Symmetry: D2
Subunit: 116 residues, 4 copies
């Protein structure tokens, strides 16, 4: 698991379950192209998005669908989504955990990067 | 104004108004003793807590009474209060900000120079 | 002033000065097009981006060029930039704040009323 | 594990390793008394602090020694420590994960509370 995404809900003190996540790579002509997608589990975690072989070096965007999450809970939030844009694997393969802590009008995001 | 406290509400996207804030200095016997207090204004800010003369070097605690803020809004919160503990050092204006959610808070210190 | 951006540095405890900020509106073909831009001031603030007349309802993106800020400080950062995407809605002043660290950021929106 | 503490370093993008943590309970006369202590592992996590039987209902304070953490890395930080004060187990036993994301002049803390 070279890429994992973890999402937490700061209103409820719980994993944020069933949150849609779309990952994009920047292509040769500098457009975003779809790379992987999935939804968080009951643990708030999304594993299995990619493999070490497919996750080549480049710029990636992880878009977390926070607006649909909040609306289904009765809340009209500020953000359309949370976006995390970063260069990956440019010094060789790494493992990335992208965490997001969500509130209706704010979010915090953190990455942990490790070398296996 | 050596010390200012700013509190924001991440559920409503607004200042956190009428939040009680207590500041304590840490004394000889090493116990906390009240130093200054107030309630945040409509802008979520609390000015006028202390003076340059009084705010000497030492360890201070700022307690923000977040539980009462959430209770008044009908929202079950996790923490009893948020606590910010730090040493003042002469080299300054301290702005202590806190962003509140029911099960999380973020706090930041901006230290700036005259 | 319908829109203000404030950027703070959690490594130094200071405003984040001279940070480039780009705002985009999201147009017909659904592409992002430049709307306003500027650099944060010595207080970490960027005022004057748009007007009430121009800031109509719609989806906007604020991109804060955090990578260049950290590079100028000699600190290896994680993100290319921080992005804040939201819909403006008539019912208002928007303050978008971002607290920066090299591998994390927090962002908050304060929406207030005249 | 009714109580776990996880600490992350936002300067380095890594677990915060070997961070001292002291937990206190509020006693009958309303003084803080020592309840448990430990240090974070290489994963940034501190497990084994207490048992369901010992972790009775009450007010607890988790003090994370962030100042010593930063100083050993060459950084003179703002806070003496990060403090997390909460009532626990007052509606029956729960499991608490207390997370803290650390920077030199800021921290964020989040709790996830689950019912086993």
């Amino acid at each position: 698991c070279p890429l994992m995404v973890k999402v937490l809900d700061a209103v409820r003190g719980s994993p944020a379950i069933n949150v849609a996540v779309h990952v994009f790579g920047k292509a040769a002509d500098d457009t975003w192209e779809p790379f992987a997608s999935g939804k968080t589990s009951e643990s708030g975690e999304l594993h299995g998005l990619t493999t070490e072989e497919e996750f080549v070096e480049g710029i990636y965007k992880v878009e977390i669908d926070t607006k649909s999450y909040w609306k289904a809970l009765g809340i009209s939030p500020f953000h359309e989504h949370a976006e995390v844009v970063f260069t990956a694997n440019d010094s060789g393969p790494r493992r990335y955990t992208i965490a997001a802590l969500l509130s209706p009008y704010s979010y915090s995001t953190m990455a942990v990067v490790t070398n296996p």
